[model samples]
Target chain A: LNPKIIIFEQENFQGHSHELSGPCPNLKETGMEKAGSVLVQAGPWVGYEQANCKGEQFVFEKGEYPRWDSWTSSRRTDSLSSLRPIKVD
Target chain B: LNPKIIIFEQENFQGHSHELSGPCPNLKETGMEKAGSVLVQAGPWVGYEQANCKGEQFVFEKGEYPRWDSWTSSRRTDSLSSLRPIKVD
Candidate 1:
């Protein structure tokens, strides 16, 4: 479970950013209210549309997401409020 | 890579379906014009919006995509026209 993720505050990996190594029940608590882009440095992490890992899920498998649309599957909301490393059991 | 994909003609895994064990440049050639849902029996495949894997890309792991929204990252099109297995090197 040594997954890592870099969430960007602006689209295309610009502006402010934060690194996460584990589950985040609320992404905003990490100081970034909105996640515009993401890089799964080492993953298989899932992002949620709502807080507490609720709502639609977007799986990140060690790759780059340059914009909201690049990472969103549901198209319900552009906001990614929660995330967690995926562990297949 | 021995990847397998079952593409459904309708959403929620209903309607006609096709099995793919390799890359497909034009899904319509497989007798299905559109893929509404998918079941990655053994994957790590990527779906494209246009023929020849040209448009927006949707990554599919070993999982179930019950609808178009479940498999698409780019919400531009609801149709899945092409697909191929992913091989990271």
Candidate 2:
């Protein structure tokens, strides 16, 4: 099943948000050019640090990440550029 | 490009190992069921905690994760069950 995720523009899941059910090579196209936090509703997903899904990446399981710190120490500059559902066996 | 990663069964990259060029839902099939260290030779990859690519996941960039702790504080029981190349812009 395709994973669903909600990304917020502010920490603690506040501000503008976007939901995705599949791969997004460029989050900028979706207007979520900057991700402050996220909520994973289904499948596991990867969030990249650069547009087109390039650069550093982080994996988010089915859960909640109220802020960037919840995912890594890499900081907010470690902003998101893209996202996609990972295969589950 | 697909990522190439080498996972070792022993910490600090010692012992049995397996190299993957793409996605593997079950690492046990490749004979490296318990990954202690990893070297990401190309694209970023996600390492799952449970078999079949389910459970907690950690993302590894193109570099080296000499041990599981280098990825997260969740510990090695946070062991790897699967891995796959994440998209690169």
Candidate 3:
């Protein structure tokens, strides 16, 4: 049993969502066009801007990201394509 | 003196600098027109988007933010107007 997290299709944790607890290499496969908001239950997770865990990295601790801007630091891109826990190996 | 933190007037820790270990209600008073980057030597500090600790709250643990985008999650604002250590109690 590890940390659990959720991502929404819209801002403020609204619209369709997915509950995950493991590595997600491509969020687009979760039946959503994009990831808009996130709720981290227990993570220090790492999110990527492109699929297959590529591009910029955004570290997400246990918290609430109510909007797209709340999760990303670099504003150049506005999409989350993958996710996984921080290094614990 | 508590935790030593530094905010730069330009990105990548360039330009003017300020070493702080206490609550700063407004960064404008420090002579830096804006905070373009930060180096958190010892902190779990709270940075605000507006002066007097108002607006968006960006929590910074022990880490490095090389650019303005690296320190802030909300992309709406480009400056950190104030800072303070997280409550220990």
Please report the candidate that would top DockQ against the real structure.
2
| lDDT of each candidate versus the true structure | 0.78, 0.75, 0.75
Q: Is candidate 2 or candidate 3 better by DockQ?
A: 2
Candidate order by DockQ, decreasing, is: 2, 1, 3
* DockQ scores for all predicted structures: 0.10, 0.12, 0.06
Pick out the ten consecutive residues of candidate 3 chain A with the lowest summed lDDT. Answer: A69-78
Whichever of 1 and 2 has more TM-score, that candidate is: 1
**Clash pairs, model 2 backbone:** none
Error of 2 at B23 (Å): 18
Candidate 3 per-residue lDDT, tens place, A1-89, comes to: 38678998988888999988889999978887878888988776767777776555565768899887775543667778888765331
Model 1 bad stretches (over 4 Å): A11-16, A22-25, A44-78, A84-89, B10-16, B22-25, B46-59, B63-78, B86-89
Residues B25-88 of candidate 3 have per-residue lDDT tens digits of 9988889788878898886677777788666556566778888777554456676888886543
Off by over 4 Å in 3: A1-89
- Per-prediction TM-score: 0.59, 0.55, 0.51
Q: Which stretches of candidate 2 lie over 4 Å from their true place?
A: B1-89
Q: Is the docking of candidate 3 incorrect, acceptable, medium or high quality?
A: incorrect
The 10-residue segment with the lowest total lDDT in model 3 chain B: B70-79
Per-residue CA lDDT of model 1 for B1-89, tens digit only, reads: 57889999999999899999989999999899678789988867777777886655566778899988786544457877888876532
On lDDT, the candidate that comes out on top is 1
Q: Write the per-residue lDDT of candidate 2 for residues B1-89, one digit (tens) a residue.
A: 55678988988989998999999999989987588888877766777776665655577777778877786543435478878775432
Full candidate order by TM-score, most accurate first: 1, 2, 3
Q: Candidate 2: DockQ?
A: 0.12
